[PDB]
Amino acid sequence: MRHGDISSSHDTVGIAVVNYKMPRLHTKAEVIENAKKIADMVVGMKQGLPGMDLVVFPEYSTMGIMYDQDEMFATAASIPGEETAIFAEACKKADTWGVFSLTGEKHEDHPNKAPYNTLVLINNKGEIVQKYRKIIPWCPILGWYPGDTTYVTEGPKGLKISLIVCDDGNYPEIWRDCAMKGAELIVRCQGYMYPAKEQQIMMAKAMAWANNTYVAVANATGFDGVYSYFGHSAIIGFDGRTLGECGTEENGIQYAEVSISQIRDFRKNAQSQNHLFKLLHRGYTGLINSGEGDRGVAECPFDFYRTWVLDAEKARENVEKITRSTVGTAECPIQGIPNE
Amino acid sequence: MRHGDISSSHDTVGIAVVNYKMPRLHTKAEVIENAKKIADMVVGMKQGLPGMDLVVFPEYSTMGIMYDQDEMFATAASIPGEETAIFAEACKKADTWGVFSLTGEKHEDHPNKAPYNTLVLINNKGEIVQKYRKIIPWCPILGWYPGDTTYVTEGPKGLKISLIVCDDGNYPEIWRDCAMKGAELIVRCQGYMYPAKEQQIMMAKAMAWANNTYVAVANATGFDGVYSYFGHSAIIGFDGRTLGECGTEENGIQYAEVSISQIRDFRKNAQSQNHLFKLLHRGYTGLINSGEGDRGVAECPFDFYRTWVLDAEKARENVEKITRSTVGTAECPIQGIPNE
Amino acid sequence: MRHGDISSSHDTVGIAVVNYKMPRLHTKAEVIENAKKIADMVVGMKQGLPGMDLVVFPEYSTMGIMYDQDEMFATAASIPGEETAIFAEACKKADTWGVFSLTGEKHEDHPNKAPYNTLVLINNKGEIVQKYRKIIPWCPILGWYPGDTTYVTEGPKGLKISLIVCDDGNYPEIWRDCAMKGAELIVRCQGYMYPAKEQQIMMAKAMAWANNTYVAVANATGFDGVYSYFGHSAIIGFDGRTLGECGTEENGIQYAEVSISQIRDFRKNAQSQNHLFKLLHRGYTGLINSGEGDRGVAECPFDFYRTWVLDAEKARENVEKITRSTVGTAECPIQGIPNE
Amino acid sequence: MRHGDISSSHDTVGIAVVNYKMPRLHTKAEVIENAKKIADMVVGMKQGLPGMDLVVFPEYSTMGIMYDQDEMFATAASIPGEETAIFAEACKKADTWGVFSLTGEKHEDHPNKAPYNTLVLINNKGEIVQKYRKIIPWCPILGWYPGDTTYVTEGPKGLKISLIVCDDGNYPEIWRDCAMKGAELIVRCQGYMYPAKEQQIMMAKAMAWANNTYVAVANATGFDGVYSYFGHSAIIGFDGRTLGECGTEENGIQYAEVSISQIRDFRKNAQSQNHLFKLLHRGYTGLINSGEGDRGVAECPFDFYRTWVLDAEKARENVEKITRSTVGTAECPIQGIPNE
Amino acid sequence: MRHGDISSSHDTVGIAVVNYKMPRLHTKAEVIENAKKIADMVVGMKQGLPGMDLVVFPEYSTMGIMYDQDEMFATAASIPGEETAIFAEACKKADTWGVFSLTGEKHEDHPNKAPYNTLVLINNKGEIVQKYRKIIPWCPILGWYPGDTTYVTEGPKGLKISLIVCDDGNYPEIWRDCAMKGAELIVRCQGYMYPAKEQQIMMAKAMAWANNTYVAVANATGFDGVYSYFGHSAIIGFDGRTLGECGTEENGIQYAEVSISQIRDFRKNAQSQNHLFKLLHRGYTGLINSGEGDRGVAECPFDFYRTWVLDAEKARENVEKITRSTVGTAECPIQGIPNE
Amino acid sequence: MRHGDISSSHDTVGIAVVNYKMPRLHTKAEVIENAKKIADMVVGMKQGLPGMDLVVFPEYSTMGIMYDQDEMFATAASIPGEETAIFAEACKKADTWGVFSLTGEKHEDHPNKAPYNTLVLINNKGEIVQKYRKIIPWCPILGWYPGDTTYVTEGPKGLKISLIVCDDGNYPEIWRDCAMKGAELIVRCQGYMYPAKEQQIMMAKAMAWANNTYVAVANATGFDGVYSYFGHSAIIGFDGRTLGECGTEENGIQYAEVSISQIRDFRKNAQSQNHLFKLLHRGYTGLINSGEGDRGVAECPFDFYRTWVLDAEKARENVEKITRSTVGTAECPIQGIPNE
Ligand SMILES: [Cl-]
Ligand SMILES: [Cl-]
Ligand SMILES: [Cl-]
Ligand SMILES: [Cl-]
Ligand SMILES: [Cl-]
Ligand SMILES: [Cl-]
Known about the structure:
6 copies of one chain form a homohexamer. By secondary structure, chain A is α/β, with parallel strands linked by helices.
């Protein structure tokens, strides 16, 4: 957990994040060309960052956003496939792990159902060791089929990694779920468009703190014909302090070293802000002093979560009374999104 | 949702938060004296803030922190009781609602079990309309018996209010639970000691954003013999932007107007960052375009929450493997907190 | 007055501002090509911002700065003309209002007098509803003929709009004049070059506060052969708080919703910082309590403004004694600007 | 214009500003006691700041705010009087100039009309050389009789000084008026209560920039029974950059050196942001190049100011249509302030 | 190197720094009373910070600043003496190390030569293990006899500590000297008065970075009759990032954990910003590639340092030509400081 | 020392710094093409900045970084040579001084020893008046032969200038050496890659403060195939306050005026923070009051500097025990950098 150098040691994972300029592409050949540019960039960066162990690219960095449905279908990737092979070679050549974005990944029922929005973690042997499908797509504008599982993967030097995508990060639950599965680094890849710049910068930090986890964010930059992406890729410590943060500049890079031993020393020995421990041992001091044993309380005291787990339709109905009952709103209509 | 004036209108609730100087008290008579000082302060403030509809005092602002167990028991309050009556009179006199702290509130089995750490919302008729007992006490150092329920109360001008205390706020779940019950303002009262200053400033903002809720934070200030409290009381909009924020100064005050109609207009019509709606309608655009109906997906896709709800002991066991198995740590022992 | 979403509601005007990359152009055909790029950008943005009701482009965004006098004359536009028609079509197609820059607009005596520097507000039917000529050109370097009038126009959803340009904004008087005519949003379009970056960021906010008005700023970016433009396009509330702000990035975009009902509720009911009201009712409490009626004092107590209005030549003479008597200075000469 | 040292030179005026803790006083004897504390503080500070040439205390620093009308009348000062004599002795003893606050100063018709809120500049010989009565009292809450004139006084080392008070500063006109009379430093003394902290910090800087003037702000701190004052006393350069700024701390001090020769060199030779010059020579480059002489345009092109000067009642009527027609509002009533 | 918790582990030293309110004292009995208050504060803090291993108090925190020469002499301490015994007991009782300030410490020729300004490091057995005399007193105002040596002491958990005082920190040389002797933490104790607040905040961070060292700063707060002290006590990592920072508040506290293993892992394995290594192996890559061996260059290439070491009088003469030749200046005279 | 305008006066040097986009070049013809682009940019900028007296370009701005050794040798420049002639013409044409980068400059033994990394100061007559070779190259990655001397040159309007390059700036010694030779402005030209962005922004400011010198920093921007450069070119006052600062944007420009008379007035008359004076007159007040004459102490009390000057090999050995003994580390190996 330290910032400023280009090295990495047996104790630290050198993480690089990339403010990748958002492509505006249309064909499979253009996607492949751009995959190769990413691969070239990984290899170049390694030559400047000898400590680099993990390189992180934004959501949509390979295809851009395929606004046109037909082009979306025609360019949706297989995984493994030609794109991931192009990425795998660069990971082997540069002896790094990497996180890359396939938007879309073909649905099992392609081309008759929406593609997934997907991330892969590829190791320094070029092997895909985690494939994560975005659980909370950025509706209404974006049309990806929602995934349903988070994953934790042993990463470089043993650092436990989970991947999440863009809009997922707005939802504290996902960051909780990954940390509770053991994640030591949550990697958030995004093509996060203006407007919500300060809010997204703040959310990553707050999640790092709340879940006692390293966080790495790679966000796209530039204007792509529709949206302007605000960069601010960053790596953040498990104590909520930024290591390094990019600005809005195209193809900015940040790089930081995250200590394996520091996060484990902290999860073991921290007390007042050992949030993962504390949430499931509530009021331990009190129960000890009241003669009720020394574990505190584990029971979930939040009816929202009880209800969502036992009766998701009721949780939904509940929320619709607070918000609205249709996915669309007649005051701001959007074609193909129903309202009224 | 606007900042700078001392007025309030039919549409806005004028919220004042107080950087109350932490008392260092020892006897019931001193507590009562200090309750009266708070009451005097409410009445004075009203004369300078004619728009004031809600006044918020920090956790521990009435008793301070009763470090000595015997004094803790001797000073624990009934609710209703003499303290709340003193507060109620000031709310009637100043025609404001108020949030006040009783630390401790007598346990049902007092003096044989730890007191609760409690907040009350008192209306402008002097009536207690919400009593909230802290669900996640600041263990290990503090010994309060944990509460188990959140509440939503119709407040001034119809604004829906939930109360939470200090350490609760580190845990996104609580802020979710209150908003999912309908809360429009989550009031976080704290006696939040250094060190974790920037982290707590950031957490309130991030929670306001993540839960599309107004947030008001009153935090104590000064040194009390043990801890130094860092102030930064604040009121924050539902879009994650601070309205006004205090510094670390003793008896700082901030004041902002929060629009009833703006938060409801937003919860109804916002789309990309209507987080409460979106969490229970995941991938709606995708499912529409894939021929699967127009509601998106409501189902909880996070195994942590499923497991915590169905088998809290397993969730606990899981977390102990990531952290530690005893509430204490031999590397930093604390008397009465077991370890090894 | 809220920030973060892409929607807009019956109550809010969705304003987008653009950090448009400064062109370096030379011919009428190149200007027309670039007008079409702007139009294309409006249509694209709308597809990502369904709430968008108003889109704002920087001063010089259409022609760039025509440094060469002959090219300046050859490219000066008529209004209405081919450029505005190109803009009008994009406003109709995207069902938005827009603010566009013509630099120059032909003088009535073209080509024998300097062109104006001009902005137009075009409605969602493609009709020009306000044409504003810059009153305080950025002398000495820039050569535009000064305009002489501010305007207030009923805009989208009834929001009252005034336009101002760049250097105008340094002068509090202009922002006062527009607000005193009824303006609810003052739109400041600029091609504001380094050096004065922080000063210009601060000025917009301070003016929003001082005049209880929404403010939207679109500023150019990039290097154009002569000047580097620093972006920081922004939308600011009437309480002086930024909604959203760009960085220095080329073709950044920000987007915010400004509430019609909030600004009117505020101008009606605010008291301590109802600056527009207060300036013309000075010392009301005092005069009431002194038995002098209940209106306060309206009379202008500032001799500078009395003198400027009655005897502008004397105001000028006065200022020349404090500054200098010639437009140029021999310590930093500039060709065609006299000094000594 | 430089910050960091305790010295001052023949070229620089050493200005100290004081975050004076707001008194809560009630009697003439208590006011005199507190005047003596201020005097003692001036003498002490000088021993630590040998460069100090000007010391600035907040509005209300001598009496506090006399909330009770009878006490307000009983404590209103003569000028010259016993308070100013107490101040004058400290200025002579410490060989400094000073700015002190008398709230109230007796009306000419005392006790039958409201006192003024007044500042004095006292030279290093103990002579009162400027007495300024607040032109825009902080209505509705505060009841001072409004003054009607600004002043410019030759100060230490020849530095031209104008004084303004608190709420005046929200109004750009006043800062313009003083600079247009020749002011090189505008001293703003305030007892500026929360809420509007960031807005007031920003306003001073923006005014320094807009009027090419040094600015010094002394603001009170602490809680006085009614209001909490937020400090942030500061000295700001004529280029809009803060020299030094206090926090919210009681009896903070800042100190900076302001160069006589730098501000005069700037007012003489600055060009693009010589705002005082530019406002009365608009479009000079354009008129030169259009064959219309080399002075630009001086004429006031702002109808608000024309109307306010010629027909203040009409300006008032105009503003009442945009805001409200009565000084009070029924949605937030205040006793003795009429509404409906 | 992590921030937020109250614990500490076998790997981390828990450092607390105190924004101690500056005393205004006059007699030996008052000094002893205040020493006891400090001791009481150490013991109290420990009860809230169980991880605390090192507690740091500001320069002047024991005596305040003895402005009066006679009182300065009458209150100058022996070390060891009654004050240090009072401190030692609190370190033993709270099982912490501590850094305390004696201003003055008796000169060897007391009372005929100025006292030193001195710091002591006292271990958790109450033993004085380092006594540092300020090398660069804050002339002209302060009169302490200059010390001449820096020290490095094995501290808690083996962490290597050097002490420096206030004005020393403005001079990069001192921080270099301590790090080059092996220091892992440089503790800077100060009673650092306004004006130079931002400059001092920045200097500590920059020194932490430049010397790859932990830094802890304890600075006084409050007004003492002469000076106002600006707090901002802090602990900073060896990568130049703040762990935690106080504001200007009286008796603020910050607390952070500094990893023994992280700083040693970094000094061993960092490459591009291993400044201590790099300064004495300049151009290693170049010399390797030019066939000149693999150590780079160690030789001092800075004539200032060569000259200062070999001929300090010449270095002095040199500097006097750039600045002035007498310690005082006639433009800002100070009694007992000669000029002209 | 003032910021915001485009003018300059007899008293001020107008300094422009350029966030030059990092080239990716390979041949001598491409280098010459890019030299011409720089020249064109100087001439253009002058037309927008009539006050400009000094223009500053980043390290590597002419050649980019020649990663390939053969291309490095083939493109290394003579000085004077064709590149400098191209620069000299633009300085004459635009009547400015300039600082330009030649990376590499041919070694005396070219092509058999590594080129230098070099800067030149070229006057407004096109004459090279200072040539500085980087003393501390950015090892390990970069291979330049280390230089050994700093220089001070009379610059525009008599302003004394020293040049330093990139990595040099991390080392306080260099900034000391230049100021102690008389430098009034230290110009730091860098191609400073991410990661260490905030650290480098802070270092320049801290050095400006510590050495009572103006500082100008020009840093490259963009991605060059290997590294992403973070801009933040800036000009900083001798009191440690930024005048103006760029962001990360390609071809950003900042411009500020630095007063000749202000820095000399300050070095003459400042007292508490006259660091250059104070370092060689330590404890003057104390020695005066102790009867030991009125010069304070000049002697170097820092053993590191004594040892480095007398026995550089011992200083080296000392540092290797604190860091490591080989230039490389086996935990992060780099080809051609030995370790173990
Ligand atoms: Cl999505
Ligand atoms: Cl608790
Ligand atoms: Cl212009
Ligand atoms: Cl007032
Ligand atoms: Cl000292
Ligand atoms: Cl280098």
